[PDB]
Amino acid sequence: DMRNELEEMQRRADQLADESLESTRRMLQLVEESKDAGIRTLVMLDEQGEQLERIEEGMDQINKDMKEAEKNLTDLGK
Amino acid sequence: ALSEIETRHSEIIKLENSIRELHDMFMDMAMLVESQGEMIDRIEYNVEHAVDYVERAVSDTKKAVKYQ
């Protein structure tokens, strides 16, 4: 009558982490810095676009003025 | 669990949101910068026209006035 039976106990392997808290924090800090740099680039790019738009009008005005002056001088000369 | 799962989930979610924000920022950057590029391309042709016109005009007028 040496017929034995058993029961079982369970253990849980550690969840997936303990490497997600050293590279993670550095990743977040770098992401924040990149976000700030992107915001600054946004602002600078908008300012540059405004300045180019401003330049356009003066360019067109000088072109028109020179063309009209040349035509007038030619007309009077002949 | 405890700090383990909460850290995993929170950091992952925050990183995903930040990355999506960066993606949108870069898209807008590209669009506006393309607009600036075509604007400068527009400037170039009129700059060339003006320089050629002024050179020809000054040369011709100087020659005409000197000869007379």
Author numbering:
A (entry chain G): 6 to 83
B (entry chain H): 191 to 258
Task: Please share excerpts from the published article on this structure.
The membrane-anchored SNARE (soluble N-ethylmaleimide-sensitive factor acceptor protein receptor) proteins provide the energy to drive membrane fusion in various cellular contexts, such as intracellular trafficking and exocytosis. Supercomplexes of NSF, α-SNAP, and either a syntaxin tetramer or one of two binary complexes of syntaxin—SNAP-25 reveal atomic details of SNARE processing and show how sequential ATP hydrolysis drives disassembly. Six NSF protomers come together to form the active form of the enzyme, a homo-hexamer.
This reconstruction also reveals the interface between an N-domain of NSF and an ɑ-SNAP molecule in detail; the interface is characterized by a core hydrophobic interaction surrounded by charge complementation. Four ɑ-SNAP molecules bind the 2:2 binary SNARE complex, with two SNAP-25 SN1 SNARE domains and two syntaxin H3 domains.
